[PDB]
Amino acid sequence: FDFQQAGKEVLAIERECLAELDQYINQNFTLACEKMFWCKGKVVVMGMGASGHIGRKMAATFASTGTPSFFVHPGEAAHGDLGMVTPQDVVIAISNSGESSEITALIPVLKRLHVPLICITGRPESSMARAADVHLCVKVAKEACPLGLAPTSSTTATLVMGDALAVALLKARG
Amino acid sequence: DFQQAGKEVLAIERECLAELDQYINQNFTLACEKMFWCKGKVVVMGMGASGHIGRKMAATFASTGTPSFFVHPGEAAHGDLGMVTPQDVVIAISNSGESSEITALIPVLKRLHVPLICITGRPESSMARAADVHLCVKVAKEACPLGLAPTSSTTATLVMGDALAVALLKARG
Amino acid sequence: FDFQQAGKEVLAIERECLAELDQYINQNFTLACEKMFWCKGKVVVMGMGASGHIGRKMAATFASTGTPSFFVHPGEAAHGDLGMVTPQDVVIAISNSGESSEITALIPVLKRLHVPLICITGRPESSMARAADVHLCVKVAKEACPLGLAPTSSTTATLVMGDALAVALLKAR
Amino acid sequence: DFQQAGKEVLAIERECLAELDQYINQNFTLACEKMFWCKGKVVVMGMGASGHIGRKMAATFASTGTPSFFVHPGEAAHGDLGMVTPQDVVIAISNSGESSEITALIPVLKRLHVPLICITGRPESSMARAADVHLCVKVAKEACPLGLAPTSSTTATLVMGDALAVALLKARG
Fold first, then answer.
1. Where does substrate bind (chains B, D)?
2. Which chain B residue has the Cα nearest residue A66?
3. C69-71 sheet: strands from edge to edge
4. Which 3 state secondary structure label does DSSP give A45?
5. B1-173: CATH class
6. CATH topology of domain A1-174
7. Residue of chain B minimizing CA distance to A50
């Protein structure tokens, strides 16, 4: 009644957000699938919190699909200062905020390794979407959480977006 | 070709979600009630992909007013679930519903009197049977050519979890 | 001969640090054992980078020893505003630095929540060292790494110091 | 009593580390060499306690100049090791030396022509046998009364790791 009622609203809200995501699978999508396709190293995906947990499942998906990739936590990379990433790698930074500090701090280091940077953000005017060689936008219009305490639609949009990159590359390799 | 393949996946999944609204049935309510009265911690656990999602799930619960944490089934094998107590609530995530790791903890999880909630894709799975409440997330179509990696299923578990989080949040205020 | 030589020097450097640790198993150690012993909730362990991975194995050991406890990344709790930790929990913040921003950022919250705070650092004059209810020191004199690029002696001391809490608590029962 | 039990655990472990020196032998040199010429990534993996340490190990390798990262054996199963290429070097951590998960990755790993290094406490183990270079970390005495949680073996692996990181670092400029 009340509970089931509350659940379906969230579901409806996220299914509507996914229908809007259709437009964002555009040139940037293709463009990013190319940077990864020609990668002789590893696709390094990294993010914070919810994003981090998604970016994680994202890395496992790439790997089991023929795109070598691994997840790394921004905070952990800071110390070793991305000693796990080389010029041969391609980095995917995930953030809905687009203003995260951890990842933002790595920008200067990542930048001066001449490693391709792909950023998945919910705002094209963010400093990640900014500094990235290629920006993949996952902007959503409506959040399924009333107080916005936790990400819902944005989180799910990123997950699906990643699956579109995984399978896309898989097909590109015939 | 790329964008073509990318949208196909997006479509397939959006189609599977539309099928999910049915599973938000009485069980959903039932599960929300078991968790709503938990005085301990909502313990979420899973394997591989499920594990990754199950992690985001726990994080979402926490920031939502439902205290919870994630634990890997294998890790708790040695400790025999030393992190789980009677006043806790367990949410086992498993699409196969026949995961060995989790299956093993089942017995131990029962003689601890901990309300077990299972999120599976098979209503006739070992976990579905042994659980006090089973939350179904079955999907009819895979978005990956060789199912090398779960797609429609994993996203169905993610949104489902988001639906439990906010539901409970609204039940409070 | 040149590699074995190097490997053996590290082993020796860390062993000499463990001998300096005996002193630190003092009144604070027992003081922390008690705070954990009467905990009715969970022993929430949290750390960053190297400390985190150890704090991770630390929680697993506690749990498998009879001390209910889990790991949680400091930055992750930043979002949930520490929604996974309640007043009847006990927090163990690991940091050799003792000035880590993330952990420092949570202090105010932990404080304003009435949660027993135990800190494991390598400097008795750090923020969390002094901001904790019980500081467990793991200071080391010599670093096994030439450029200090990665923590070596301090990291291994924290692992042992933790193993020293799990077994002690265990025996206490 | 508490401090009494905390110091004994410390002694027992310090004793085991004193037994480790011997193992920092030829195999150590081999391991260091194959990792030194690695053009890809040093991929560390393990289960439970081993896993948490193998993690700090990867972090330590990286921050030291040895590009590396951790991956859970189970997770790698589904992707048939999609993370690893022929250009990589694998470090499998397992005290038991008979872990089912890691054993399964062996055939695949060999069929990739990737250099396999194993860190075990059992020279006669399956992964000790099937490895290109077995690095021994056997310990005579356990710090835990009921062996509910690894202690000496877990700590020996950690140090053995630190010894490869800095050893390789010094081998560089």
1. 65-66, 72, 78, 104-113, 138-140
2. B148
3. C69-71, C43-47, C90-94, C117-121, C134-137
4. strand
5. alpha beta
6. Rossmann fold (3.40.50)
7. B56
CA-CA distance, A55 to A60, in Å (whole number)? 9
Please give the interface size between B and D, counted as residue pairs whose CB atoms are below 8 Å apart: 23
The closest of A154, A155, A101 to A128, measured between CA atoms, is A101
| Cβ atoms of B56 and A50 closer than 8 Å | yes
Is C40 annotated to bind a ligand? Reply is: no
Every domain of chain C and the residues it spans:
1-173
Task: Indicate the burial class of D8 (C-beta count within 10 angstroms; 0-12, 13-18, 19 or more).
Answer: middle
Query: From the centroid of its chain, how far is CA B43?
Result: 11
Residue A35 burial (CB count, 10 A): 17
DSSP conformational letter for D145? T
User: How far is A32 from chain D, CA to nearest CA, in Å?
Assistant: 19
Nearest to B48 among D49, D51, D78 (CB): D78
Residues of chain A in Cβ contact (below 8 Å) with chain D: 41-42, 60, 62-70, 72, 76, 79-86
Q: CB-CB: which of C49, C79, C80 is closest to A76?
A: C49
**Tokens 């985190």 -> residue:** C52
- The DSSP string of C132-157 is SSEEEE---S--SSTT--S--HHHHH
The DSSP-derived string for B60-120 is: HHHTTT--EEE--TTHHHHHTSTT--TT-EEEEE-SSS--HHHHHHHHHHHTTT--EEEEE
Closest chain A CA to residue B168: A3
Nearest-CA distance from D125 to chain C in Å?
Answer: 23
Angle at alpha carbon of residue C75, lines to C72 and C77, rounded to 5°: 55
How many angstroms separate the CA atoms of B4 and A30, rounded? 10
Does the beta-carbon distance from A83 to D64 stay under 8 Å?
yes
DSSP H or E stretch at residue D70 = strand D68-70
Q: How far apart are CA C170 and CA D6, in angstroms?
A: 11
The C-alpha atoms of residue B146 and residue B149 are separated, in whole angstroms, by 8
Residue D44 per-residue DSSP state: E
Which residues contact residue A122 at a Cβ distance below 8 angstroms, ignoring those fewer than 6 apart?
A96, A97, A98, A137, A138, A139, A140, A154
Contacts of D149 in chain C (CB under 8 A): 60-61, 64-65, 163, 166
What is the C-alpha to C-alpha distance for residues D60 and D72, in angstroms, rounded to an integer?
17
By Cβ distance, the residue of A144, A147, A163 closest to B151 is: A163
For residues D45 and D54, the answer to whether their CB atoms sit within 8 Å is yes
Both structure tokens of B125: 């799975």
Sign of CA pseudo-dihedral C69, C71, C76, C77 = positive
Q: What stretch of H or E contains A157?
A: helix A153-172
Q: Which residues of D120-130 are buried (b: 16+ CB within 10 A; e: fewer)?
A: bbbeebbbbeb
Q: Measured between beta carbons, which residues in chain D are less than 8 angstroms from residue B144?
A: none
In this complex, do A79 and C52 lie within 8 Å of one another by their Cβ atoms? no
Look at D48 and B148 and tell me if their CB atoms are within 8 Å: no
Cα gap B58→B44, rounded to integer Å: 6
> Which residues on neighbouring strands pair with residue B42, listed in sequence order?
B68, B89
CA distances from D165 to C12, C33, D58 (A): 15, 34, 9
* Amino acid identity, position D93: I
